[PDB]
Design a protein around this ligand. Structure first.
Ligand SMILES: OC[C@H]1O[C@@](CO)(O[C@H]2O[C@H](CO)[C@@H](O)[C@H](O)[C@H]2O)[C@@H](O)[C@@H]1O
Lengths: 140, 144
């Protein structure tokens, strides 16, 4: 399961947030985009796949994933197309929304907070640690 | 060669600005095309980067975008030690790869990400070696 991601959209302050969750780790990446378009989705996926070993993305079946540009991006990147941390992200965005002028800044603060937050006590791991451990282990 | 050290540079192509972050120990890169080297764009890039990797230190070219208060405030928030002026065949490398995929993309920003993808997946050191992508996670992993 190291190459499995789930992608979802969130709408906030009349803007769109694209969120990718690495399913096995809970690690997230996110971008704020003007609108939920095929071009933006394709670009997002291309960035994701240049950064992590992406094999499969699970999506809602919106039209932004059907587009020919998204299909070309996925073909090129070797990606196959097919809420727990999602309500959380919204939560953290609120907790810090005041520390920032723009929405996209608060979003990236929340991603930061989420990915570095240790789960559990001493002995625990953050999501950022889990994803790299999983991938490093897979590579052996 | 600490695992937490990144170098940021900029490169210009077709009248556009590419901000590049290089994980020094592994050669792994991240990049974005931005409208101009401003404080807020730079600060936004750094905050995203720090959200995705354990960034302890960033070496910069001391450009005016880094001396801006917006960037210094981002580094402070993210706990990044900003090291300005601390010392490049990487930019030559990225530009070369960008050339090899440029006719597959309608827009430069797309060709840049494709180039980043190719660089990070390229096996270095022969069939027996590893890519920058493999190297960064092997270096950064705390519990294998
Ligand atoms: O290069 C523009 C491209 O980047 C995206 C994210 O994929 O926009 C975000 O990232 C840029 C680079 O950091 C920022 O300049 C921009 O403001 C931010 O929204 C895409 O939306 C866009 O196509």
């Amino acid at each position: 399961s190291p190459g499995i991601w789930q992608l979802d959209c969130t709408h906030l302050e009349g803007k769109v947030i694209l969120v990718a969750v690495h399913v096995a780790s809970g690690y997230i990446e996110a971008e704020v985009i003007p609108a939920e378009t095929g071009q933006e989705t394709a670009y997002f996926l291309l960035k994701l796949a240049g950064r992590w070993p992406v094999k499969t993305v699970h999506t809602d079946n919106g039209s932004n994933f059907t587009s020919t540009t998204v299909k070309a991006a996925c073909d090129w990147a070797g990606i196959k197309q097919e809420e727990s941390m999602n309500k959380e992200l919204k939560k953290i965005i609120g907790q810090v929304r005041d520390q920032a002028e723009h929405l996209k800044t608060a979003v990236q603060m929340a991603v930061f907070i989420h990915n570095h937050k240790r789960k559990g006590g001493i002995g625990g791991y953050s999501a950022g640690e889990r994803i790299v451990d999983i991938i490093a282990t897979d590579i052996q």
